[PDB]
């Protein structure tokens, strides 16, 4: 078993009130079965697109999740991952 690493980042420079894309890149996990959710103010974003599952030279799996979003001053965004390596779901917050 390998524990997923999670990184959250925007496609474009964030400006409040401008449409953008938020990416949640999940890496270094094994086995490949995994659940990834993107959250807005603590609630699941319904339409999140998922790349195909793939793997690295080292055999660990990776996958990209992304969703359309328009940041504001007060909205918080996160990516939450459930996986058999972790008793608890891991949540990573988008910075600023």
């Amino acid at each position: 078993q390998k524990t997923p690493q999670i990184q959250v980042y925007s496609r474009h420079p964030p400006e409040n009130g401008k449409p953008n894309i938020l990416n949640c890149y999940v890496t270094q996990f094994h086995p490949p079965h995994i659940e990834i959710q993107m959250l807005k103010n603590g609630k699941k974003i319904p339409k999140v697109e998922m790349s195909d599952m793939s793997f690295s030279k080292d055999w660990s799996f990776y996958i990209l999740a992304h969703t359309e979003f328009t940041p504001t001053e007060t909205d918080t965004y996160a990516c939450r991952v459930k996986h058999a390596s972790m008793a608890e779901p891991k949540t990573v917050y988008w910075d600023r």
């Binding site: 390998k2 990184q7 980042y9 925007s10 496609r11 474009h12 420079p13 894309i21 990416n23 890149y25 094994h30 086995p31 490949p32 079965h33 697109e49 790349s51 195909d52 599952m53 793939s54 793997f55 055999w59 660990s60 799996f61 990209l64 992304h66 910075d95 600023r96």
Partner: protein, 272 residues
């Protein structure tokens, strides 16, 4: 100078449940997807058939269709006899393809992992376990090595078909493979794990190809620049950030400079 890789991911949860999913990459662009749910291999590029004809592609696909079913059955047959030495859940990964070199050369490979660990390869004319692989694999590998039709086919696929196919992709996929997308950069800051510091972040996104970032004070490179990993965007461009943990007030005079093939001598420089 590219690496072509076909990646297969197979999961066996029990006697009744299995799935096998594949993806194919030419360097860092995806060319194919082959889902468990689909009969046929899907192209993820206009040029994914390379320079093979429809007939050649059909034959190649047929061989892989036969293979996927034969593979699933052989593995489950092997899980019935091995029980309870090794049992479910079982993960198998294959990574097969070739590396294309300066004009002439090409080398092919076929590697297999079991439960996340490299255990088998095809090499020359036969399947081999790697040193340190579990010894119960020796008999299945012998059985597999007795199948000379499989060995001949795999030899043809690695020696011939793989470099042939990739030459065609390189030609037919020229403008995507040699595309140039420009980085857009921006600066931010986040709390530092060190007291009395802030972490300055230079973000670089939308660039293609991969090669690309330094914090600067005038002409002086800041050796504290911590470059992160290359992270994919969803539109086949790349994202990278470079951080710098800075004392308060030491912040003034800092710039982030970015160099990329697509900017043609004209670096981006942002000032904090």
């Amino acid at each position: 100078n590219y690496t072509f890789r076909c990646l297969q991911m197979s999961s066996f949860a029990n006697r009744s449940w299995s799935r096998t999913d594949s993806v194919v990459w030419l360097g860092d662009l995806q060319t194919h997807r082959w889902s468990n749910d689909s009969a046929t291999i899907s192209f993820t590029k206009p040029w994914s058939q390379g320079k093979l004809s429809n007939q050649q592609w059909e034959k190649l696909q047929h061989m892989f269709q036969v293979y996927r079913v034969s593979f699933t059955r052989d593995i489950q047959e092997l899980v019935k006899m091995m029980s309870p030495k090794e049992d479910y859940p079982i993960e198998i990964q294959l990574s097969a393809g070739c590396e294309m070199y300066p004009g002439n050369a090409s080398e092919s490979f076929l590697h297999v992992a079991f439960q996340g660990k490299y255990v088998v390869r095809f090499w020359g004319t036969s399947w081999q376990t790697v040193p340190g692989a579990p010894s119960w694999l020796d008999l299945p590998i012998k059985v597999l090595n007795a199948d000379q039709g499989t060995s001949a086919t795999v030899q043809m696929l690695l020696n011939d078909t793989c470099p042939l196919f990739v030459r065609g992709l390189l030609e037919a996929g020229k403008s995507d493979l040699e595309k140039q997308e420009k980085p857009v950069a921006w600066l931010s800051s986040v709390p530092s794990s060190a007291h009395g510091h802030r972490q300055l972040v230079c973000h670089v996104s939308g660039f293609y190809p991969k090669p690309v970032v330094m914090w600067m004070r005038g002409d002086q490179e800041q050796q504290g620049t911590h470059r992160g990993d290359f992270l994919p965007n969803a539109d086949e461009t790349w994202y990278l950030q470079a951080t710098l943990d800075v004392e308060a007030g030491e912040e003034a005079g800092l710039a982030c400079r970015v160099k990329h093939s697509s900017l043609g001598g004209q670096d981006i420089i942002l000032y904090w």
